[PDB]
């Protein structure tokens, strides 16, 4: 009967950068999703496989909750099967993803008049990613021609990049926080219900 925390996932100050998204193994709950409509008017609340109007009365199992923060015009790459620099290098959902993608505007929280140089993404990599797997290693990207011997600059590139997140950018570049729930629905024990 104890409502397991969505507030420590949603209503938190620090959201992690997109190359290391958080994982909160949420289980043994009696979870009701009435709290999700009070916190913010959502920019994009899309679900895949279950409708939001019947989302309360099911009974899930192995529900995950992730968290990161990305740009404005590339929040639509957090979806099954999209292609870009986000969905191949930082966060890829599988093609049979069956949860819900929540993303609201957060320009007041995560934007300075100086450069908010904490939120970073990975831009260059050897190959693409598997679904649901992140890379946090900061080894130098080879440009493909000759070895750099761990030297940044020419013949190579430093694999990360920073966001600006200034309020004078506009709606396309101010930061959006993204919470993506991942139900692995219809298995045996079914510990989470409503």
């Amino acid at each position, epitope marked *: 009967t104890n409502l397991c925390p969505f507030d420590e996932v949603f209503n938190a100050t620090r959201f992690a950068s997109v190359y290391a998204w958080n994982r909160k193994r949420i289980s043994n709950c009696v979870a009701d999703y009435s709290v999700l409509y009070n916190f913010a008017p959502f920019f994009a609340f899309k679900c895949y496989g279950v409708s939001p109007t019947k989302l309360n009365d099911l009974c899930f199992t192995n529900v995950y909750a992730d968290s990161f923060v990305i740009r404005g015009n590339e929040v639509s790459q957090i979806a099954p099967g999209q292609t870009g620099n986000i969905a191949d290098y930082n966060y890829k959902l599988p093609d049979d993803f069956t949860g819900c993608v929540i993303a609201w505007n957060s320009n*007041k929280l995560d934007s300075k008049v100086g450069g908010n140089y904490n939120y970073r993404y990975r831009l260059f990599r050897k190959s693409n990613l598997k679904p649901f797997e992140r890379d946090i290693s900061t080894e130098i990207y080879q440009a493909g021609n000759k070895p750099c011997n761990g030297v940044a600059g020419v013949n190579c590139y430093f694999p990360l990049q920073s966001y600006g997140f200034r309020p004078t950018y506009g709606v396309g570049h101010q930061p959006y926080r993204v919470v993506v729930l991942s139900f692995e629905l219809l298995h045996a024990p079914a510990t989470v219900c409503g």
Partner: antibody
Amino acid sequence: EVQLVESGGGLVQPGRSLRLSCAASGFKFDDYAMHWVRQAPGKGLEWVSGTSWNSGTTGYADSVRGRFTISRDNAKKSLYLQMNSLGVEDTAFYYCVKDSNYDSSGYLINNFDYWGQGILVTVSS
Amino acid sequence: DIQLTQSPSFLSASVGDRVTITCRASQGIDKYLAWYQQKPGQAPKVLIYAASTLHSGVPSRFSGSGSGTDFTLTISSLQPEDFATYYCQQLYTFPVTFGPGTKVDVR
């Protein structure tokens, strides 16, 4: 609620050194920032120092620049301010003040939310 | 850097009156400014952040307005607990600086 107890205040002589301390209890310390603000007995408020969630961006005022140094230690839920080469003008109540947003002054949602009781460090001798 | 000035420097208002306090900066700081209140002998507390949004716990009679360089703080119905001084605080960038102070005494 929010409980911020501070210690280290005492009568000292000019030219000495001392370390201020501030414990925290009742919130998540590493997610919120911290600052220090002093208030003279005759004057108003004046911002002393500021630190980030992980000491990423720290800045001081131009008056106490160099003489003071802040540090963050998330293990003990504590806060440290070290003052060196004090003058007679620094007799004030130092409030260990909890910020609200994660990092600093620039973000719109910044407000010095909870303020400690404050301790007087009086240096005249 | 940035300098904050307050006008007026003193007031004397009775119970039920309306008070306006002004606050100006040397440049445009773009709404990143707060307002605080200190009764003598205790700790200060938050009233309004970003000049238009109140913090939780205080009543809704408190309100601020304005943007750009000049800011106003007004209370429609003054109360006997509100007899204290009020400080500005700018929040554009480091270093943070405050206002000189305007106190509210009895009339």
